[PDB]
Symmetry: none
């Protein structure tokens, strides 16, 4: 399993402690993404950030982690776009989108 | 699949968060490369760095990852050169070049 | 393909970023070797290190990777010696030596 | 080729980098063994370890790899014993012993 | 040679390094089995595990490998039972039991 | 012997280690099948999976291996159905069903 997206998750209604942890304006969902190789977090962050309304929280190229905030709908589109591109273009094996 | 280039990607128009993550002067594209064996990231970085105008961001010999910044055209040539050499000379099985 | 040398490469003129990555004195070529089984990187490193003028950068027995620095001529001899011994003595199927 | 010993090698005079890689007391030869099936590295390690003076470096049951240190003479006997038992008792097709 | 048991070996007195490699309580013999087809390692493990006193170390269905620990006598019975069933019932061509 | 079913086995009472190896809910028998040509594991898996209550563990088209879990009775019917179809329809030479 070379190129894998192992997580593409959305937190619809986060809590104070979750917002305070990331440093967000406590208004919107949070999209979380894990993929290998770890460096392609930079490419995932680019596609998530194309929405512009979406705010990039952190991009970790060492662990392969991306997080971003914004309206529930924008986050779902950003995750959906990441999964679709990486699958079709970059030939990744993607996991289904998940909600909490 | 011993000798493989699994990614040879170019980000034409990166965002603040992507630039800030790598520590670039927020002016140009970013070329991303993943290959196995992981040590040959050193050889890929050499061919990408031959352009000189191209700036090597990071070379990870453990994961097999290379990133570099510069004008969209320089990055494409660097990626094209890496794919061509590794394929013809080093007998790698290369993936097609990708744009985002 | 049990016993294989898949890479026996020399980088004649490396760059700052390549030197800084390995931690070399920025003066000489770099010999890169990949072989299977992965443990025989220890035997390859021994033959490369017999030159003494050659400096062993890293030996990875898990991936089957060896790297070493020194004058372009010393590195070529070390790679040539590795290829010749492994082929004739240890009955490996070796790839041709490559330059970048 | 079901049951094969593909390597039964001794490094008479290893170098700092080779010792440092394995984590040995920089005093003696190193015996290297590769065999298939990979699990029988456990049986090879047992026969090499019967000498007791011989120190088992690593036993990899996944790749089929064994390494051990000690006086040049002890290592040769251990390798010779492994080759002789596996050939005569376990019906393996063994390669000749090799020195570097 | 479709259905073959190529190894059915017992290590009467294993060493620290052999125990530490498998992760056993350093008290008893180790039974090692290799057979083709590789999937029938699951059936061999079942017959070895029927003794209950015997502890299954690992079952590899890809390589066709089984290992298990316990008192020398229990391991011999388990190996003897595997050889007898596979030979008589499953119509395998079995190798003789071996001791080290 | 072109078209052969060499194994059509059922494990009535598997153990923790056998379940953990396959990744089953530790409740039911395991049906194991080996046939040549190796690709027809896909056809055998189809007939075993027609029961629906039966869960397909793995289908290997390279080795010609099928495994599946479920109630002892369902597994026996699935194996019986595979043997009957392959024999009568596909003109295979089948081995007798076996229990452990």
């Amino acid at each position: 399993p070379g190129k894998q997206i192992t997580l593409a998750h959305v937190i619809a209604a986060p809590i104070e402690a979750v917002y305070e942890c990331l440093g967000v304006d406590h208004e919107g969902a949070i999209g979380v993404v894990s993929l290998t190789p770890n460096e392609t977090a930079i490419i995932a962050a680019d596609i998530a950030g194309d929405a512009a309304n979406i705010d990039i929280c952190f991009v970790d190229r060492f662990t392969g982690s991306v997080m971003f905030s914004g309206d529930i709908q924008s986050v779902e589109t950003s995750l959906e776009d990441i999964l679709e591109y990486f699958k079709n273009s970059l030939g990744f094996s993607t996991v289904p989108l998940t909600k909490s």
